[PDB]
RNA sequence: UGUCGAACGGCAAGUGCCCCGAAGCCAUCGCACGGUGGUUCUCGGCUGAACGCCUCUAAGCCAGAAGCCAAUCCCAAGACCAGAUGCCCACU
């Protein structure tokens, strides 16, 4: 067992990170995020004067140590979520039947996927903003916006997995909704 | 057919026999009704290290089968209900 293993992260000026009982609260501009990490059993420290976040595993083998970088990635993702945000742009790809997508409030409706009469409905949580790009700029583009990377990516994946092609050769029937670009709001 | 003399009324033939026949029982041979949510499988994914890259997995999440569990349905306190009540009596 390695006696001490640690990971370090620089904290920007406009964000504050608070740690208490393995519960991380990252609060910059544009909002605040909270991550429950009570399942990890690590030692989390924040030096506010030096703007550093440190996670330490004491007497760890490979399995406990591998969670150090995972915690660092999660805290980093929260930081860029509260500073710049997350924006996912997904595209509707079709061969013959156009994919008609309607976005009203927090509800997405997909019709005419491969000519099916069934309507595919999805309810986006209020923490993720959904919008449709005007067709003149980009054709068949849905944009998901939020501060939580996991919430934003889950919403895009949920939409993508709704329009799966069944009982067909997927190498030839490439119709679906795929996320094209992943960027930041600011 | 026999029989009380005939007619009437019947009666015998272990319901004489034939037709129709209510009530009741009864036929997918007739008619009525047969519903709601979760936990997971397999699998597909998200985030993501180990291993600066990568990766559904290692810690975390999402979606998810006629399986499984509960609701609904049937019996139901030896499941000993200090559940709620109506009248007496007992205690007071
Ligand atoms: K006879
Ligand atoms: K008859
Ligand atoms: Mg076929
Ligand atoms: Mg007779
Ligand atoms: Mg005689
Ligand atoms: Mg019957
Ligand atoms: Mg999986
Ligand atoms: Mg099931
Ligand atoms: Mg009872
Ligand atoms: Na990945």
3-state secondary structure chain A: CEEEEEEEEECCCCCEEEEECCEEEEEECCEEEEEECCCCCCEEEEECCCCEEEEEEEEECHHHHHHHHHHHHHHHHHHHHHHCCEEEEEEEECCCCCCEEEEECCEEEEECHHHCCCCEEEECCCCEEEEECCCCCCCCEEEEEECCHHHHHHHHHHHHHHCCCCCCCCCCCCCEEEEEEEECCC
Burial of A79 per CB tally in 10 Å (0-12, 13-18, 19+): buried
CA–C1' span, A40 to B59, in Å? 6
CB-side neighbour CA atoms (13 Å) of A6: 12
**In angstroms, what CA-CA distances link A24 with A6, A15, A147, A177?**
17, 13, 15, 34
CA–C1' span, A29 to B15, in Å? 104
Report whether A3 contacts A47 (CB < 8 A).
no
Pairing of β A107-111 and β A86-93: unpaired
Please report the resolution in angstroms: 2.2
Report whether A63 contacts A114 (CB < 8 A).
no
Q: How was this structure determined?
A: cryo-EM
The alpha carbon of A181 and the centre of ligand 9 are apart by a number of angstroms equal to: 66
CB-side neighbour CA atoms (13 Å) of A35: 27
The alpha carbon of A55 and the centre of ligand 2 are apart by a number of angstroms equal to: 96
**In angstroms, what CA-CA distances link A60 with A7, A125, A129?**
13, 38, 41
């Amino acid at each position: 067992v390695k006696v001490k293993s640690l990971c370090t992260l620089q904290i920007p000026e406009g964000v504050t990170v608070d740690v208490k009982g393995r519960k991380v609260t990252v609060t910059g501009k544009r909002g605040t995020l909270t991550k429950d990490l009570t399942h990890l059993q690590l030692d989390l420290r924040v030096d506010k004067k030096n703007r550093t976040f440190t996670v330490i595993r004491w007497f760890g083998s490979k399995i406990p140590i591998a969670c150090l970088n995972t915690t660092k990635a999660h805290v980093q993702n929260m930081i860029t979520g509260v500073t710049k945000g997350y924006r996912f742009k997904v595209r509707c790809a079709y061969a013959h039947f156009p994919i008609n997508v309607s976005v009203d409030g927090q509800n997405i409706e997909v019709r005419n996927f491969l000519g099916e009469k069934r309507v595919r409905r999805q309810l986006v949580p209020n923490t993720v903003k959904v919008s449709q790009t005007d067709p003149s700029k980009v054709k068949d583009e849905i944009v998901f916006d939020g501060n939580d990377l996991e919430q934003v990516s889950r919403e895009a994946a949920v939409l993508h997995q709704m329009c799966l092609v069944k009982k067909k050769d997927i190498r030839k029937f490439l119709d679906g909704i795929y996320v094209q670009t992943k960027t930041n709001i600011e």
